[model samples]
Target: LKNAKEDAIAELKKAGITSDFYXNAXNKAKTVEEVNALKNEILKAHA
Candidate 1:
């Protein structure tokens, strides 16, 4: 969702998200497909 960064939940996850981040990220997704997309994006090399 567009609220990820701004959401209080997301900020808390930043503290110690771990697997919970994935779970919450799933809830924030618009579709199931985006979940994998997000995962790959996370795993992808970026700076």
Candidate 2:
């Protein structure tokens, strides 16, 4: 989980985003629903 968050942070940075928003969601995620929501948010952010 930590690696995934760090990797996402690195990629998001390259995309010109701070990643704080997604990182918050990633860290707070405790359920599959929450993670899936984060995934959608990340994909949309990158898009």
Candidate 3:
């Protein structure tokens, strides 16, 4: 899960999302589903 969070964060950063809100959310994410959900949100908003 930790690695998934890091990967999500990296993907977010690549998409130019540097907000602490997402990072904090990633850190608090305890499951892959949560992290993936956040990733989808970021993608939908920025894609």
Candidate 4:
């Protein structure tokens, strides 16, 4: 999901989150930054 966060948000928005849903989907990261931190490093692009 490194390259797809924005795309995912776009698609999710189209479907609607409504605050009540996904506010706590799992005992999981609340933001992309938190999610990426689980990995050792984050690469924005590959050359």
Cα lDDT computed for each candidate against the true fold: 0.53, 0.63, 0.82, 0.40
| Tens digits of lDDT, candidate 2, 1-47 | 34555555566667776556666765687565665566667679668
lDDT of 4 by residue, 1-47 (tens): 35444444454446553443333432354456754442212222210
Task: Put down candidate 1 lDDT per residue, 1-47, tens digits, no spaces.
Answer: 45443443454355544676666765686653565467546555221
How many residue pairs collide in each prediction? Answer: 0, 0, 0, 0
| TM-score leader | 3
Model 2 stretches with alpha carbons more than 4 Å out = 19-39
Worst 10 residues of 3 by lDDT: 21-30
What TM-score do all the candidates reach, one by one?
Answer: 0.36, 0.46, 0.80, 0.33
Task: Report the lDDT tens digits of candidate 3 across residue range 1-47.
Answer: 35888888888888899788877786588798998887998899886
lDDT of 1 at 35: 53
RMSD of each: 9.4, 3.5, 1.4, 10.1
Q: Predictions ranked by TM-score, top down?
A: 3, 2, 1, 4
